[PDB]
Amino acid sequence: KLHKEPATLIKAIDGDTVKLMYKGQPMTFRELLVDTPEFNEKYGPEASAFTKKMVENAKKIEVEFDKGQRTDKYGRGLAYIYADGKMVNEAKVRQGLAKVAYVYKGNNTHEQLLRKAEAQAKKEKLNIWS
Numbered sequence: 001k002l003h004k005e006p007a008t009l010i011k012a013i014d015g016d017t018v019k020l021m022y023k024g025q026p027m028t029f030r031e032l033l034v035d036t037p038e039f040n041e042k043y044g045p046e047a048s049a050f051t052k053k054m055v056e057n058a059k060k061i062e063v064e065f066d067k068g069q070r071t072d073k074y075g076r077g078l079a080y081i082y083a084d085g086k087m088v089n090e091a092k093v094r095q096g097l098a099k100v101a102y103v104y105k106g107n108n109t110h111e112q113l114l115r116k117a118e119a120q121a122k123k124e125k126l127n128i129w130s
């Protein structure tokens, strides 16, 4: 079982990263288990906007670390990010604005939940799957 922890938004960055204050320190977080198009790729601007809206509108941001590595080789926090209880990682995949990706053993608790969301976005031909 994983645990949600508090954080506050410092700044939206792009489709799958955001700047949050966590235990009182500014950090860039990179969303576990997903990949968004870069800004210049088809759907890249839409993904950034989607994440932005979701984190900016949240009254409460939380981060949830998985069982494995909590920071990547770039110093980015690796987490599932929640906005008012709704996982931002999942919500983007469900809308076809991210693909499930970067699934490493031991940081993959939510892998099946996210693949189910992606299956539904693909069935619906949403966005990336259009």
Ligand SMILES: Cc1cn([C@H]2C[C@H](OP(=O)(O)O)[C@@H](COP(=O)(O)O)O2)c(=O)[nH]c1=O
Binding pocket: 030, 031, 032, 033, 034, 035, 072, 073, 078, 102, 104, 107
């Ligand atoms: C999501 C994720 C990315 N990464 C590293 C793998 C990729 O290395 P490389 O930079 O060498 O390609 C990079 C992709 O992140 P981005 O999609 O933000 O570019 O982030 C991790 O190590 N663990 C993770 O869980």
Ligand SMILES: [Ca+2]
Binding pocket: 016, 035, 036, 037, 038
């Ligand atoms: Ca990316």
